[PDB]
Symmetry: C2
Subunit: 434 residues, 2 copies
């Protein structure tokens, strides 16, 4: 019986907390920029609410009332929220931990407790306006996160099942064909099609016709060239898809997001989910944020069953955390876990009480101060503390300096002091910091 955290969970040390807080600040400043409200659901949904998904869900003991299960997702508690509250229209974000009892990776990548960050627009609006604002938010966040260059892959589910019908897939086999052509973004088309024909039983006569399609990506001229596609310009589903994507491109150009977006027919994920557009943000390589339009979901909890057409995105914050805390281990620079603005110290031997008097004045004024919990602390150790915690300023109290009603304001990094009268001290600390 050892001291540790359950297999796959993890303590967040104060440094990690600082990183995650600084990422969350960017993200939430954007969500608030677009006027999104915030909601919060319980950490466990009433067991039978989470039925219809993979049974990797933590179950709880009876031991009293009913049975329960911890949430493996954030969008299902959202659908429950809208059905329960009888809401026809909301723009929200939701940032909270999720729990999936998978085998925790040892490489790593995958945990059992981790953070999920979802943003959603729910309601029946005019066509592709909210779907486009989602991409806008995605690129504001990714750009403002300073994590290098990113690209946004977009597609439509209708263009999918439509093109897959046109090439020739069995609807009893179409699923794993999407689960396979999805892998093209990470392996070659040849290692896709050889694995495909090698494990699928469908004629390469068909897989080749798929290959002429899925191997294509480009800008608006691609949705327009595929509008000219005679074999495709005859499918209702697909025509709808390419249309929505066309108008979406127009709105994106208006938003200035024209360049960082590519129409990539290889993208094919979450079909138990997406009924319209599908996003995936990538770096320059790996996934960072994804999402799309999913209308038939939220209506799966209404008494009647009226459709709640929803679009949304989800930021992969658990990865961005690592990208940051490893851009920080790269530059070998420290991260400030605290906001402390000055440390109050004294080199003389019986000045602890006066130190307290000063610190309480600096707190009451508002500036974030601190002192060391020893009656007669030695000044060199006291300055080492500031050098470690990144504290920028030290306010030193001396007896003959007390006689003059002043304070020595030694900078920890410049090592240069200055006598400042007790009157001006507050505004002076306020001057040398933020």
């Amino acid at each position: 019986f050892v001291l540790k955290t359950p297999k796959g969970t993890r303590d967040y040390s104060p440094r990690q907390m600082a990183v995650r807080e600084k990422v969350f600040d960017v993200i939430i400043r954007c969500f608030k920029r677009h006027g999104a409200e915030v909601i919060d659901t319980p950490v466990f949904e009433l067991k039978e609410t989470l039925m219809g998904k993979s049974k990797l869900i933590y179950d709880l003991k009876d031991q009293g009332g009913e049975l329960l299960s911890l949430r493996y997702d954030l969008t299902v508690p959202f659908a429950r929220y809208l059905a329960m509250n009888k809401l026809t229209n909301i723009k929200r974000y939701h940032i909270a931990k999720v729990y999936r009892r998978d085998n925790p990776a040892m490489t790593r990548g995958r945990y059992r407790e981790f953070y999920q960050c979802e943003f959603d627009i729910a309601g029946n609006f005019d066509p592709m306006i909210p779907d486009a604002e989602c991409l806008k938010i995605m690129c504001e966040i990714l750009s403002s996160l300073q994590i290098g260059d990113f690209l946004v892959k977009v597609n439509d589910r209708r263009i999918l099942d439509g093109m897959f019908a046109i090439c020739g897939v069995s609807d009893s086999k179409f699923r794993t064909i999407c689960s396979s052509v999805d892998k093209l973004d990470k392996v070659s088309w040849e290692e896709v099609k050889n694995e495909m024909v090698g494990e699928k039983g469908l004629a390469p006569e068909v897989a080749d016709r798929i290959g002429d399609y899925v191997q294509q990506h480009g800008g608006v001229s691609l949705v327009e060239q595929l509008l000219q596609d005679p074999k495709l310009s005859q499918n209702k589903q697909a025509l709808e898809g390419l249309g929505d994507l066309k108008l979406l491109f127009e709105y994106l150009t208006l938003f200035g997001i024209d360049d960082k977006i590519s129409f990539d027919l290889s993208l094919a994920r979450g079909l138990d989910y997406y009924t319209g557009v599908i996003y995936e943000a990538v770096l320059l390589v790996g996934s960072v944020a994804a999402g799309g339009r999913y209308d038939g979901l939220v209506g799966m909890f209404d008494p009647k069953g009226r459709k709640v057409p929803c679009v949304g995105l989800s930021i992969g914050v658990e990865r961005i955390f690592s990208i940051v805390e490893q851009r920080l281990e790269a530059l070998e620079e420290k991260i400030r876990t605290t906001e402390t603005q000055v440390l109050v110290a004294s080199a003389q031997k019986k000045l602890l009480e006066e130190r307290l008097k000063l610190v309480s004045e600096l707190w009451d004024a508002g500036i974030k101060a601190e002192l060391l919990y020893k009656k007669n602390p030695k000044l060199l150790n006291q300055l080492q503390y500031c050098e470690e915690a990144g504290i920028p300023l030290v306010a030193i109290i001396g007896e003959q300096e007390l006689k003059d009603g002043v304070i020595k304001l030694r900078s920890v990094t410049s090592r240069e002091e200055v006598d400042v009268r007790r009157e001006d001290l507050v505004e002076e600390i306020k001057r040398r910091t933020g």
Copy 2:
């Protein structure tokens, strides 16, 4: 139907979120003012980590791996974190959900100082932080009653200790707003020195105290580490501040959007898109209604219902002049300004 959020647990509408964020804002703005790091633990530990009244604990099924258990306290994960990392010194707060089956899922706000420190300094600071938080927390007075475990017991050292705390508090200007009362007993199974709680004058608002053995439990060497803590019953405070907020008539905003880019004319959606992107790329946080051709009245009513005080009206006459029309939803007066002046002209009126 019968879609039920589990018993004892309720959701959080944006109206309630608006309250919890402000309360948490003065709280965190205070714990940051004293230079306190923050840590976060998993929501569940091992069941055996949460042993010795003790069966109000939430458990998990056998799974096929370990027996896990939802946390019923924040100082127990604190203790296993201190013992795990062999940390002999840390000042730390923590605001997260706890799960005690008796509400049932509720927020705990713990703040504890730990380390070998000269007599009664961290205790006095815990009191100063309690008074800062509660004072800036809008409510009335506090008269936080303090006491000692070692006097209820040897009982001399506690008299000396509380004797040493009072002058520190007088230096903090805190003396007058505390008290000395000995009927204060609960809780007492885990505390070891000072014990205290505040009470609101018009109850369980804030409580805590020094406890030193609670951490040395998990230490294999038994090397006990001292500690002095405080917890703020934020679930009461949420209700009291949202209760004062209804008796004060003022609406509680759930959004911060300062402009709604609008148009009364038709076919001007795309121009409104150019505008909302120019405003979003800038600092200001505008919004736009999701319809190609909305009517101005619907948008203005949306603004007077959401709290958005400014409306960016785009008209063709306005468009071709390089100028955008601006109507304050409150005063209904109009000012038409250059597109270049628009961003700073919104930052100015907000």
